[PDB]
Amino acid sequence: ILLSSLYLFNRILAWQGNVKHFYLFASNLLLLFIVVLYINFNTFSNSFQFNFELFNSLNPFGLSNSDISNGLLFGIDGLSLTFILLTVLLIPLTLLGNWYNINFNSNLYYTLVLAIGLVILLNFWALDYISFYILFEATLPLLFILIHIYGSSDSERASFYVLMFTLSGSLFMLLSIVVISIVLNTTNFINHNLFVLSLDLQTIIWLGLFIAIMVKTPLFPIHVWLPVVHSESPLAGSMILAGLILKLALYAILRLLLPLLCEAQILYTPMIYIISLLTIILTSLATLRQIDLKVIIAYSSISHMGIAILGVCSNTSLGIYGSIVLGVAHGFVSPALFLIVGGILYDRYHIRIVNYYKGLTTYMPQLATYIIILSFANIGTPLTGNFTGEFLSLQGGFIRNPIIGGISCISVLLAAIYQLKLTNKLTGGISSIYMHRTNDVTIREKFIMNILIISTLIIGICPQIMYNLLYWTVNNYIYII
Amino acid sequence: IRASFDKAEEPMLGDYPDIDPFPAQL
Amino acid sequence: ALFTSLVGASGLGFATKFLSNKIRLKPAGYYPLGYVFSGVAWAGLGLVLHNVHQHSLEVLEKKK
Amino acid sequence: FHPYNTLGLATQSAMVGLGAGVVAAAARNSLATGPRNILTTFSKSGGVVTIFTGASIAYVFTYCSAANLRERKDGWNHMWAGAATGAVLGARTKLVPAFIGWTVLCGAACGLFGWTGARFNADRKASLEQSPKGFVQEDAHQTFWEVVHRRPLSLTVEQLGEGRGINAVPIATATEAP
Amino acid sequence: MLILAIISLITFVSMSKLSDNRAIIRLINIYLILVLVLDSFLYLLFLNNQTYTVMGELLIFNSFTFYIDMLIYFIMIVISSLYGYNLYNNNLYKTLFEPKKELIILFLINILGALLIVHSNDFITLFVAIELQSYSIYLITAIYNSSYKASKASMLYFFMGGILSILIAYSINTYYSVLNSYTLHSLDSLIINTLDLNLILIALSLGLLFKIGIAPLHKWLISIYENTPILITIYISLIPKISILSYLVLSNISINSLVISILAILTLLVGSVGGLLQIKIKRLLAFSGLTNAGYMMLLLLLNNNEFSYLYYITQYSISHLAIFMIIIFSIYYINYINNQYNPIIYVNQLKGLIHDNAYLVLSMAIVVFSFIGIPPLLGFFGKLNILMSILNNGYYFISIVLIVASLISALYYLYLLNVSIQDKNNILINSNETVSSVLSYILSSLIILITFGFIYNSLIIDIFNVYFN
Amino acid sequence: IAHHVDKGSLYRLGPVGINRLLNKASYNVINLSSNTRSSLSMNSMLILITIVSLLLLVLVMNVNFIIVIPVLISILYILFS
Amino acid sequence: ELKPSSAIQRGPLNKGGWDAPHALHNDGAIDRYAHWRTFYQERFKYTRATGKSTLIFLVAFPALIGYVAYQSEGLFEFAGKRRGESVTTR
Ligand SMILES: CCCCCCCCCCC(CCCCCCCCCC)(CO[C@H]1O[C@@H](CO)[C@H](O[C@@H]2O[C@@H](CO)[C@H](O)[C@@H](O)[C@@H]2O)[C@@H](O)[C@@H]1O)CO[C@H]1O[C@@H](CO)[C@H](O[C@@H]2O[C@@H](CO)[C@H](O)[C@@H](O)[C@@H]2O)[C@@H](O)[C@H]1O
Ligand SMILES: CCCCC/C=C/C/C=C\CCCCCCCC(=O)O[C@H](COC(=O)CCCCCCCCCCCCCCC)COP(=O)([O-])OCC[N+](C)(C)C
Ligand SMILES: CCCCCCCCCCCCCCCCCC(=O)OC[C@H](COP(=O)(O)OCCN)OC(=O)CCCCCCCCCCCCCCCCC
């Protein structure tokens, strides 16, 4: 099969010369395959199901059928299946969103994009600390190359930021994982809640894990790399970085931190709440004085991630469900907003400064309607998954600490402010003098936007539709005596 | 130039025009 | 499995031949016999590694 | 904790800093280009002797003083000592932002050093390799590197404190009717 | 086999004309390969970590030394290929890379000295081996005597290495004056407790360690690396480092040394920071070598270091060979040849290499990310094993400094790739001459090892458990 | 918040401040032997200085390890700043 | 005498593509403003005003939130509380 499929790839490349149709076909097959897996996934069981081991000493190039496990473990539960579905929904759209605007050396570009998607998808399958860490880091060089070669004017500084900041946090995570490795002589996620380290050692291991979380989420005050990296990235990079990669941190909190360091997490929760409240408030206010469209959209993600953090660290079932739902809804809506600012407007005008844009409604009524819809989705209008996630996250946060969550409720207003301030100027007023009339949104751009809006609306009207994969998850991680 | 917050930025320009600001509405 | 080890090692040899063709600015299938030679050689190395590992496991088991 | 003798220890530090600065001045005098005599070594020292002496005084005095005042020995004392040392070294800039930057950042680096144990090599006896590890036996107290399957609930109540889900009795047991 | 090759080569080369040089090297190349594949089975002797004293207790053979010997053979094979095979057949490359008449003999004698250092069980063996390697390395540095920089470098090497050889000799004689012995085997836990040998043993350690150029005595060796011909630099910056470090790893005479801890920290800081402003490729690679030497220096502070040292030194040797080969391959695409000994000097001369040879730049990217430590490349697993070792033994501050140095040195590693993937205005369309099949295959094999070696990690650990436990 | 914190202090404890710091530190360490003409004489002086300083430092450590911490800080300051 | 091989034929690097008409009429003043705003970190300095903002947002505000969050930890329980019952636990 692999031999035959490689021959197929080779011949397609020989004759067409562009690999992108093959990549679109492969990713669509991957999505269908994941849906088939979901069909055969047992929901009345909190055990990992589609398990396999790679690079075992008895079968380094095959699957392990041995009585000793020394390779890298993979498998899924409901939590990981949720994010895997999000990943395979997003990958073909990130291919399709750059269908026409990549012209020089396009085969390499699409290879990088698909590789990054596949690495993230495998990362969600990882069942031990080392396999997780390997797939966690492997995206960094691919992103470095993609941003350096295919990014906008400031893309060298951006590639260096996306490599250096993430490496910086990851190395402290690596310290924590090494300590776990040598202290427990085990690294897997299946039984790691059975090991109870002393409270002191727990407190120390938590710090490394949380520094990595702080850079990857990101949280205040180590967030300042994300606007630069998002602003200078090509569109597929931005879509993957906002829709998928940031969700890896929330997943890491649930999978790597809470089951193992429960008592230390209880001890550290007020500090987390300080950091998340600072993230929400300060980054929301800092967004008000930005002049780059893509920077504004990027800053929005940080505040929503702060709300998700507050939910996921609330020690309540509602908070964890809200954090996951918020992650998924953000994964729908943020790539759509990045598509608008860095895919549609930027491909027509090749500029991102807010002063140039005004009154797009006259010649492009459809784009204005998309902007309005996605803006009110982004600020958590009900019947959108964003509202469900934010509302449940705030409920959990308020229960965990009434004062801190109560103050967190101001995010509704603050997000409304920055987002609607942008959309008011984008749609209203007289058509700008600095730009000439261009085409309204195309069929491909509308297709992508429609997919994302329908997804967020479906989970906004009936969020319960995710519960069949997550009802074990909302109890697996809370620590109550 | 006129307000405290425009003045506070004076060290922050080098070779950018120090413009005296006027509200466009006026 | 020994057969899987041989396939994997031969694939490593194929990758070596491909990369050497590319670095020489040559087409992928430039001298196709080289693919066979490279695959055979790397399969030999993989077989040696497999046999040494098997002997090591045998020794670890015989001290029990 | 019995106190450090701040005065005597600090005087020792003064002597050592003066000696080290003298040695650095001699090396500086030998390595440089241009004409140089035996008296120019302090003339063209760059104040290096003062660097050494002042750093020695600041660090040792502040460390001993903070340790005695708190009646503790831990990394915080080294944080204070590094803060004072950074204050001395950043005074040479003659600029307030740089003085503040040296203060806080040297204090943070030395606090990090003190937190790891205030040593460059290892405390071999305390290390994991020289310590009881793995799963503890029947009912023994858990030590720093040891692992258990269940901790005692009394220990959890003591360490975390009561509240926000931590209770001396599980809820369902306590709310059972009879 | 090595001694035989040296004798036969001296005779054969004496009776040979200067035009036979490359042919002779090719012969020795295949000879070495044969010794590696027909004499490999001797590994069986060391099953269950059996140790053999040999030559009236002058030499020690175990699994560690056998592995180091195999690694040195492999390195010699790779490096001798670079002299025996022409990259291109044009006149310029004949001028750039022509082996001297006696170079192959000097290489084989230096390899003998290295292997004797590794196996040294007595201090007289150690000193004779050290002087053999040192004298050979001076002559290797000097043999391109039309170059002003190489002759000056050889003089500097002779004098600094002589001072350090004197320090080593004085250490050995103080040890003898205290114990009436020339072997570390006479050291016991009781002796170490009873006597203060720390000053003597650290003096020996420092004498050995300054010979491979740790801080603060790093600049002289970096100068020598910059000022030698590039094909000499590939050899002389690797083999001594391996031999000396392997001996110190096997001797374990500096466990929990405060002085070694401080010098290792200084070496990591100097190596990472001092590489940042470098604009010459060989100076950048020399600072990289300094940082990796600091990484390995950390393993001299603890027992049971064998797995992490062997893994690190193997993957580092592979990466060092790969990066020098890539730099050599890129010479064909540069606009300006600086001189015949160092055809390429400045990192900026690699600008736009991706438009001339894309897969060469892919090879560079893989090697650079391995040096940085991105999984699943071999460099990541080397650094992971070192971190496991040092944190098991309580070196917390040093682990933090290791992380910081890794991050800092990533900047100058990425400099190479950064310039190499920028745009250049005049790009290559076609060229009739192809680079050599042999050398391209060797480079590709190294790249593939760096990329896919992790697949064998658990199998390797299984074998290690039966030959080193 | 956006200029003084996000693009002020946070870049100072970030890319801009670290870039400036590393620039000065790297310059200082590479120029540790800058103006000298005879590499032999300077490198020999360095090995003598290293040996003597290590001896005196270890003597200090035998006395009291806390007293040596400021000396090491001063030496690092000399080398990198 | 040391020159690159004559066998090499170098042409120009053209990325190709269709040059679209210029739909944006660039304003130099706006571009200069955007450049000043985007690279402000390169010109930032610690003065009284910027230092005051630094102290309010990176020191004072975190300390207020931290005091609140460590003082009120575990303090409140609200679920189903009735008249006369304490809503506080300490
Ligand atoms: C992600 C950020 C990384 C930065 C944070 C790292 C900070 C490391 C600090 C924590 C830690 C190393 C833990 C390493 C774990 C993995 C390392 C993690 C990765 C490292 C990168 C170092 O603890 C150090 O703390 C310093 C104070 O700050 C002290 O300073 C000095 O204080 C003065 C000297 O007396 C001097 O005046 C001066 O010399 C300094 O002032 C040191 O002496 C002390 O060793 C603690 O380890 C140790 O904990 C103790 C009791 O906890 C353990 O023994 C216990 O004994 C009973 C009670 O004793 C318990 O009943 C028992 O159960 C348990 O057996 C030990 O066996 C050992 O294990
Ligand atoms: C037919 C004859 C061919 C043999 C020629 C060997 C040449 C060595 C040349 C270069 C060194 C490269 C690395 C050597 C591999 C270590 C083997 C071993 O397992 O190392 C162990 C010790 O592990 C260690 O310490 C750690 C080693 C660290 C290795 C790091 C690199 C890993 C990536 C390598 C991936 C393998 C590629 C396979 C391709 C299909 C010693 O094993 P051993 O002493 O029992 O000897 C083996 C039996 N032998 C003599 C017949 C071969
Ligand atoms: C360079 C980065 C670091 C690289 C380190 C990791 C490299 C891994 C290389 C990718 C290969 C992993 C995917 C293939 C393994 C799965 C093969 C398989 O058969 O899974 C076994 C599992 C159980 O199968 P079995 O027990 O045999 O029973 C079958 C009953 N009918 O059957 C199943 O349950 C199905 C499992 C589905 C798993 C989904 C995998 C999605 C991604 C597949 C391709 C990913 C490619 C990534 C490429 C970039 C590199 C990361």
PDB file of N, CA and C in Angstrom, chain D residues 2-43:
ATOM      1  N   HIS D   2      21.833  29.425  64.272  1.00  0.00           N
ATOM      2  CA  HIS D   2      22.554  30.354  65.122  1.00  0.00           C
ATOM      3  C   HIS D   2      23.248  31.404  64.257  1.00  0.00           C
ATOM      4  N   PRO D   3      23.328  32.649  64.729  1.00  0.00           N
ATOM      5  CA  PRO D   3      23.637  33.769  63.830  1.00  0.00           C
ATOM      6  C   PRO D   3      25.023  33.703  63.204  1.00  0.00           C
ATOM      7  N   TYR D   4      25.111  34.240  61.988  1.00  0.00           N
ATOM      8  CA  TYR D   4      26.389  34.635  61.418  1.00  0.00           C
ATOM      9  C   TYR D   4      26.938  35.839  62.172  1.00  0.00           C
ATOM     10  N   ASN D   5      28.262  35.907  62.278  1.00  0.00           N
ATOM     11  CA  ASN D   5      28.920  37.090  62.832  1.00  0.00           C
ATOM     12  C   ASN D   5      29.167  38.035  61.665  1.00  0.00           C
ATOM     13  N   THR D   6      28.231  38.965  61.465  1.00  0.00           N
ATOM     14  CA  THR D   6      28.238  39.789  60.259  1.00  0.00           C
ATOM     15  C   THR D   6      29.518  40.609  60.153  1.00  0.00           C
ATOM     16  N   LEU D   7      29.973  41.182  61.268  1.00  0.00           N
ATOM     17  CA  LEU D   7      31.127  42.074  61.220  1.00  0.00           C
ATOM     18  C   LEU D   7      32.396  41.329  60.818  1.00  0.00           C
ATOM     19  N   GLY D   8      32.685  40.207  61.478  1.00  0.00           N
ATOM     20  CA  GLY D   8      33.929  39.505  61.200  1.00  0.00           C
ATOM     21  C   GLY D   8      33.943  38.872  59.823  1.00  0.00           C
ATOM     22  N   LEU D   9      32.832  38.237  59.455  1.00  0.00           N
ATOM     23  CA  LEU D   9      32.698  37.646  58.132  1.00  0.00           C
ATOM     24  C   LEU D   9      32.829  38.711  57.050  1.00  0.00           C
ATOM     25  N   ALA D  10      32.230  39.882  57.279  1.00  0.00           N
ATOM     26  CA  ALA D  10      32.324  40.974  56.320  1.00  0.00           C
ATOM     27  C   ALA D  10      33.736  41.536  56.233  1.00  0.00           C
ATOM     28  N   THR D  11      34.458  41.591  57.354  1.00  0.00           N
ATOM     29  CA  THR D  11      35.847  42.033  57.302  1.00  0.00           C
ATOM     30  C   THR D  11      36.700  41.062  56.499  1.00  0.00           C
ATOM     31  N   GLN D  12      36.509  39.761  56.731  1.00  0.00           N
ATOM     32  CA  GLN D  12      37.153  38.749  55.902  1.00  0.00           C
ATOM     33  C   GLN D  12      36.867  38.990  54.426  1.00  0.00           C
ATOM     34  N   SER D  13      35.606  39.284  54.104  1.00  0.00           N
ATOM     35  CA  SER D  13      35.241  39.571  52.722  1.00  0.00           C
ATOM     36  C   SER D  13      35.995  40.783  52.189  1.00  0.00           C
ATOM     37  N   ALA D  14      36.113  41.833  53.003  1.00  0.00           N
ATOM     38  CA  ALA D  14      36.873  43.015  52.604  1.00  0.00           C
ATOM     39  C   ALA D  14      38.296  42.646  52.218  1.00  0.00           C
ATOM     40  N   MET D  15      38.973  41.878  53.078  1.00  0.00           N
ATOM     41  CA  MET D  15      40.333  41.446  52.758  1.00  0.00           C
ATOM     42  C   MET D  15      40.376  40.681  51.439  1.00  0.00           C
ATOM     43  N   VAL D  16      39.468  39.717  51.260  1.00  0.00           N
ATOM     44  CA  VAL D  16      39.553  38.871  50.070  1.00  0.00           C
ATOM     45  C   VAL D  16      39.277  39.679  48.810  1.00  0.00           C
ATOM     46  N   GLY D  17      38.291  40.572  48.862  1.00  0.00           N
ATOM     47  CA  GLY D  17      38.016  41.426  47.722  1.00  0.00           C
ATOM     48  C   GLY D  17      39.187  42.319  47.370  1.00  0.00           C
ATOM     49  N   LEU D  18      39.850  42.882  48.385  1.00  0.00           N
ATOM     50  CA  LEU D  18      41.026  43.701  48.113  1.00  0.00           C
ATOM     51  C   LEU D  18      42.130  42.883  47.454  1.00  0.00           C
ATOM     52  N   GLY D  19      42.373  41.671  47.953  1.00  0.00           N
ATOM     53  CA  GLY D  19      43.383  40.823  47.336  1.00  0.00           C
ATOM     54  C   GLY D  19      43.051  40.471  45.897  1.00  0.00           C
ATOM     55  N   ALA D  20      41.802  40.071  45.652  1.00  0.00           N
ATOM     56  CA  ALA D  20      41.387  39.687  44.308  1.00  0.00           C
ATOM     57  C   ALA D  20      41.465  40.865  43.348  1.00  0.00           C
ATOM     58  N   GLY D  21      41.066  42.053  43.804  1.00  0.00           N
ATOM     59  CA  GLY D  21      41.198  43.234  42.973  1.00  0.00           C
ATOM     60  C   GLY D  21      42.644  43.579  42.675  1.00  0.00           C
ATOM     61  N   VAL D  22      43.529  43.396  43.657  1.00  0.00           N
ATOM     62  CA  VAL D  22      44.951  43.623  43.415  1.00  0.00           C
ATOM     63  C   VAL D  22      45.467  42.672  42.345  1.00  0.00           C
ATOM     64  N   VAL D  23      45.088  41.394  42.438  1.00  0.00           N
ATOM     65  CA  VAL D  23      45.519  40.405  41.451  1.00  0.00           C
ATOM     66  C   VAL D  23      44.993  40.763  40.065  1.00  0.00           C
ATOM     67  N   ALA D  24      43.720  41.158  39.987  1.00  0.00           N
ATOM     68  CA  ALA D  24      43.141  41.539  38.704  1.00  0.00           C
ATOM     69  C   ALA D  24      43.830  42.773  38.137  1.00  0.00           C
ATOM     70  N   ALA D  25      44.199  43.718  38.999  1.00  0.00           N
ATOM     71  CA  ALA D  25      44.946  44.885  38.545  1.00  0.00           C
ATOM     72  C   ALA D  25      46.303  44.488  37.977  1.00  0.00           C
ATOM     73  N   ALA D  26      47.003  43.564  38.640  1.00  0.00           N
ATOM     74  CA  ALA D  26      48.301  43.122  38.130  1.00  0.00           C
ATOM     75  C   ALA D  26      48.161  42.443  36.770  1.00  0.00           C
ATOM     76  N   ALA D  27      47.153  41.581  36.624  1.00  0.00           N
ATOM     77  CA  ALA D  27      46.924  40.922  35.341  1.00  0.00           C
ATOM     78  C   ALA D  27      46.575  41.935  34.257  1.00  0.00           C
ATOM     79  N   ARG D  28      45.700  42.889  34.583  1.00  0.00           N
ATOM     80  CA  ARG D  28      45.335  43.956  33.659  1.00  0.00           C
ATOM     81  C   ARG D  28      46.566  44.740  33.222  1.00  0.00           C
ATOM     82  N   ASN D  29      47.471  45.011  34.161  1.00  0.00           N
ATOM     83  CA  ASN D  29      48.686  45.744  33.831  1.00  0.00           C
ATOM     84  C   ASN D  29      49.591  44.939  32.908  1.00  0.00           C
ATOM     85  N   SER D  30      49.662  43.623  33.104  1.00  0.00           N
ATOM     86  CA  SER D  30      50.529  42.820  32.247  1.00  0.00           C
ATOM     87  C   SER D  30      49.944  42.584  30.856  1.00  0.00           C
ATOM     88  N   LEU D  31      48.621  42.478  30.730  1.00  0.00           N
ATOM     89  CA  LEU D  31      48.019  42.115  29.449  1.00  0.00           C
ATOM     90  C   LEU D  31      47.841  43.288  28.489  1.00  0.00           C
ATOM     91  N   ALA D  32      47.980  44.524  28.946  1.00  0.00           N
ATOM     92  CA  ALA D  32      47.607  45.665  28.127  1.00  0.00           C
ATOM     93  C   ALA D  32      48.728  46.072  27.175  1.00  0.00           C
ATOM     94  N   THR D  33      48.356  46.849  26.163  1.00  0.00           N
ATOM     95  CA  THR D  33      49.301  47.454  25.239  1.00  0.00           C
ATOM     96  C   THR D  33      49.577  48.897  25.646  1.00  0.00           C
ATOM     97  N   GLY D  34      50.564  49.496  24.988  1.00  0.00           N
ATOM     98  CA  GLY D  34      50.990  50.834  25.316  1.00  0.00           C
ATOM     99  C   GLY D  34      51.971  50.832  26.468  1.00  0.00           C
ATOM    100  N   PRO D  35      52.620  51.971  26.708  1.00  0.00           N
ATOM    101  CA  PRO D  35      53.590  52.044  27.808  1.00  0.00           C
ATOM    102  C   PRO D  35      52.926  51.774  29.149  1.00  0.00           C
ATOM    103  N   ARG D  36      53.635  51.044  30.008  1.00  0.00           N
ATOM    104  CA  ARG D  36      53.126  50.718  31.332  1.00  0.00           C
ATOM    105  C   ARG D  36      54.285  50.511  32.293  1.00  0.00           C
ATOM    106  N   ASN D  37      54.190  51.154  33.446  1.00  0.00           N
ATOM    107  CA  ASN D  37      55.161  51.070  34.526  1.00  0.00           C
ATOM    108  C   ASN D  37      54.529  50.366  35.720  1.00  0.00           C
ATOM    109  N   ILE D  38      55.269  50.317  36.829  1.00  0.00           N
ATOM    110  CA  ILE D  38      54.773  49.565  37.975  1.00  0.00           C
ATOM    111  C   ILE D  38      53.724  50.346  38.757  1.00  0.00           C
ATOM    112  N   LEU D  39      53.698  51.672  38.647  1.00  0.00           N
ATOM    113  CA  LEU D  39      52.692  52.445  39.365  1.00  0.00           C
ATOM    114  C   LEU D  39      51.439  52.695  38.539  1.00  0.00           C
ATOM    115  N   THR D  40      51.530  52.590  37.216  1.00  0.00           N
ATOM    116  CA  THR D  40      50.372  52.792  36.356  1.00  0.00           C
ATOM    117  C   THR D  40      49.334  51.686  36.492  1.00  0.00           C
ATOM    118  N   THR D  41      49.669  50.579  37.161  1.00  0.00           N
ATOM    119  CA  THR D  41      48.740  49.458  37.257  1.00  0.00           C
ATOM    120  C   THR D  41      47.454  49.861  37.971  1.00  0.00           C
ATOM    121  N   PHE D  42      47.559  50.673  39.021  1.00  0.00           N
ATOM    122  CA  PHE D  42      46.364  51.233  39.640  1.00  0.00           C
ATOM    123  C   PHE D  42      45.869  52.471  38.904  1.00  0.00           C
ATOM    124  N   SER D  43      46.778  53.226  38.279  1.00  0.00           N
ATOM    125  CA  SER D  43      46.363  54.375  37.483  1.00  0.00           C
ATOM    126  C   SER D  43      45.477  53.947  36.322  1.00  0.00           C
TER     127      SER D  43
END
